[PDB]
Ligand binder design. Sequence first.
Ligand code: SE9
Ligand code: MN
Ligand code: MN
Length: 180
Amino acid sequence: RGSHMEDFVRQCFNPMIVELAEKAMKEYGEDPKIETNKFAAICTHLEVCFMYSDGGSKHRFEIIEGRDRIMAWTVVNSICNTTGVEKPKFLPDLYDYKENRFIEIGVTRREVHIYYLEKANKIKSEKTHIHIFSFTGEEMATKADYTLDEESRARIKTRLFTIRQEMASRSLWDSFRQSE
Ligand SMILES: COc1cc(CCNC(=O)c2nc(-c3cccc(C(F)(F)F)c3)[nH]c(=O)c2O)ccn1
Ligand SMILES: [Mn+2]
Ligand SMILES: [Mn+2]
C-alpha cells in the first residue's frame, strides 16, 4: 500500500491538515494511500487556505474549505442570507467580510493563466473572487485585487517553493508536476 509520497505528505504537513485532507478525500471517493499526488495537492491547498485566512485581521475571513460538505454549505447559506451575495453554484474556499465576497483559492503547477481561466469558466457568477498561486512564485487575482498585503502573499509563495524543493529532493516532484 504505502509509498514514499504518502510518507512525505505525512512528514511535511501539519497533522490536522493531513487529517482534514484525508477526510475530504474519503468523502469524495478518493484514497490517500493510492492517490498520493492528489493527497499532497489537497494538503497544500488546505495549508494555503489557512495561511491566507491568517493574513488579514481577526474577523477578516470566514473559512469554508476544510469543513465537511453539509456544514460548509450551511455557513455559505448563512453568509448569503445575512449579506445578500448570491449563492455560488460551487463551494468556494473563503469569505471576505471586509470586501464582502467569496474567495476561490487555487494552487497550480502550470501557468496561472490556464488555471485561472478554468476557474473563471466554472464559476458562472463572476461575483466570487479568484486568486491563484503557482508552485513557482507567480500569482493572479481577479481585477488584480490581490486582497491581502504583500508580506502575507510572499509567505505563501515561499512555503510553496519550499514544498516543491522538498519534493524534488526526494525525486517526487516530476510525478507531482506531471499529474495536474
Ligand atoms: C477535497 O478533495 C476533493 C475535492 C473534490 C471536489 C471539491 N474540490 C474543491 O473545492 C477544490 N479542489 C481542489 C483540488 C483538489 C485536488 C487536486 C487539485 C489539483 F491541484 F490537482 F488540481 C485541486 N482545488 C481547489 O482550489 C478547490 O476549491 C474532488 C475530489 N477530492
Ligand atoms: Mn474549495
Ligand atoms: Mn480552492
